[model samples]
Target: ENAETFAFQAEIAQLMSLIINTFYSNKEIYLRELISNASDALDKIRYQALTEPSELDTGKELFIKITPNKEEKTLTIMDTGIGMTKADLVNNLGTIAKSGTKAFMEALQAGADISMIGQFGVGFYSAFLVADKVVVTSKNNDDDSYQWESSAGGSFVVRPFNDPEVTRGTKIVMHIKEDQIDFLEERKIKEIVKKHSQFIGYPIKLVVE
Candidate 1:
């Protein structure tokens, strides 16, 4: 009732890898994938507040933050958006909505069209195109904190929480690939943000060291 962990359908592992590798080009779309995710997350929390304002935390300001780690070849995307429970994570990240892998793969191969990302709704998987590992740390309004980590493999590991250094939100760290190291540069990320994301009202900042 209060909290629970959810599992993806058996086909999720294959589907995630397929979308990450074949569906998108340029790899830069990871920024768009993450930014879009942040927007959607904020929208969900705002929508939920109408019915259950008691569940909302007034102190936390809704926002998104980006950071790059050159030493570990990782770029972190953080947002104070609505977090997900273990079940929500598995269903959203792992399984397609009432669809099987074959149909999803067919759709990606058919045509991404306007969406450079795949036809499937698993936008987070785009991180895999640039990073070897993806780590997601999140805290929902009512649930305890939780972490999910995967290397684009068939499975993911989820464990009990730790106190986040920041307020409630999601932090997605994309381990930059050898050739993809350029993303760690502040200037490059800034340009990308300005180009594709200028219209977005939220602030985008780089944590420079």
Candidate 2:
């Protein structure tokens, strides 16, 4: 059973709103950030399996799938990796680590390098630079599948979900903006993956049309 929706921390909301109003000058790296996060998830599971083999969900293949839908104007990226629990989502996505919102903004205004921002662990927010809305569906062996949705604004919504297809892993559905509709094209997606995520430890497949 899924619980009620939880609001993001004040700092998270501020960060989202800040990105919504600014950035996107480097929107090309959105997919890069997503794949980087997926690779990290895979790394976590692989490392755990080293000490506790059973921690690995043997039934799930380890890979990343990119599906771009023209009709829906959406791009869905799925990863067969260690997924998140409700608490993990809240703690990881709902709060900025190290410096808080104000300092982050100050740094940005002071001309901080965009490439270095993700190192602070807020790479996921980069999705908002392109997509109008982002929905994350994650399944962890220790918990039921859940859906997290955000519009890069004041708050986000989270609820319980059960997708038989998502037996284990994380799926991120990006509602591409009209101006960023190219992201829904397979050609563009392939180019982005090749440029940014080609060296990712796992195989990343762009589903054929």
Candidate 3:
């Protein structure tokens, strides 16, 4: 699991902490944020499929799955869609690609809805609201599979993974905090998805056996 480590810019670190703390009023929105990201990825691939028929071979089904592990106290949301490369992992998660850290810091301080701020691509960091550590595994046809892990307000690690299961798309595992155990409940995930992501243009499934 050893890999190169990268430090977020000081401003990025500041915004990460700020967003995590500012969204306390609606922490549950983190799931919506992540699921929205998955939807976007799926939509992108679906569009690409229009031009290249074989792109769907990565995974024929385009859906999002929410799975919980009570023993490990982890909640994972996986999506069958276009995934990220190493550079994408860093740029998308490590840096503020749209609004820039300074603008986001101002917006949060000015009291903007954190849910709406996701369009800037900073919403992925919302996972830190419930978990101290977050791990992301992704694979794309254009790039090899890789794992990215991080704890909010600091640095993160990325390494190659020869994962057969991750033939394509992304899986995000959130190590739920003790106080955030409510997120591990299947019913809770269902409620959140119904309320927030119901019209998100993809099937959001609660994996139940």
Candidate 4:
């Protein structure tokens, strides 16, 4: 029940296409996305256990670790937060949030209820800008290990991690494209973060040599 795949709204594909092609050029914006993501992860677990404190992932501090594996041409963003469950992968990562957001926008225009739009993990399309493929290995306390992958082609692939021996958290592995080699540079990554997301709530650190 916790490990499966799902589909996103059709409009989400268009949104993803728009973002991948027209998103920020600064690259530093990634730092903001990653850090903001980390902060949110910590808050989720904290809020869930605010009254019942025994459920937190003990001995794990909340933080963001950015690792650029130039040898493998991959960029990894690791976070200690409320990890994804099976349903999360099938829905959150699988489905596009744009269609829902668009409907909300339209409904509000008609003087209906207005909640929020574009409220998911910035959606996986952001990863397509740098990585040719994206892989997420996550484990929450109540679920088994799972891997969510997408090249952002026509579809994405989701399955179990193959290896169940996983720590409790989330790791986003970005398979950087050859043209986006600049992202592999430690100096460039640091500069990008400082320029765009220096004070983005959570502490940002790089895994340098």
Q: Cα lDDT of all candidates, in order?
A: 0.70, 0.78, 0.82, 0.66
lDDT of 4 by residue, 25-130 (tens): 5444554565666678867876777776665644256677889988898888877678888778767775635445455434435554211222433424556667
- Give the best candidate by lDDT: 3
Q: Write the residue-wise lDDT of candidate 3 on 72-152 in tens digits.
A: 999989998899988888787785345556786787788876665576556777788789789999998898899998887
Between candidates 1 and 3, the lDDT winner: 3
Q: Kindly report which residue pairs in candidate 1 clash with one another.
A: 6-87, 73-176
Candidates' RMSD to native: 3.6, 2.1, 2.1, 5.6
Which order, best to worst by TM-score? 3, 2, 1, 4
Estimated TM-score per prediction?
Answer: 0.82, 0.90, 0.91, 0.78
**Which candidate, 2 or 4, has the higher lDDT?**
2
Which window of 10 residues has the lowest lDDT sum in candidate 4?
A: 112-121
Ranking by lDDT: 3, 2, 1, 4
lDDT of model 3, residue 28:
88
What's the lDDT for residue 49 in model 1?
A: 77
Superior candidate under TM-score, 2 versus 3: 3
lDDT of 1 by residue, 19-94 (tens): 5566355667678878988887877777777898765663346678888888878888888778877666655676
- How far is 87's C-alpha from truth in model 3 (Å)? 1.6
On TM-score, the leading prediction is 3
Stretches > 4 Å off in candidate 4: 1-7, 19-24, 96-124, 162-166
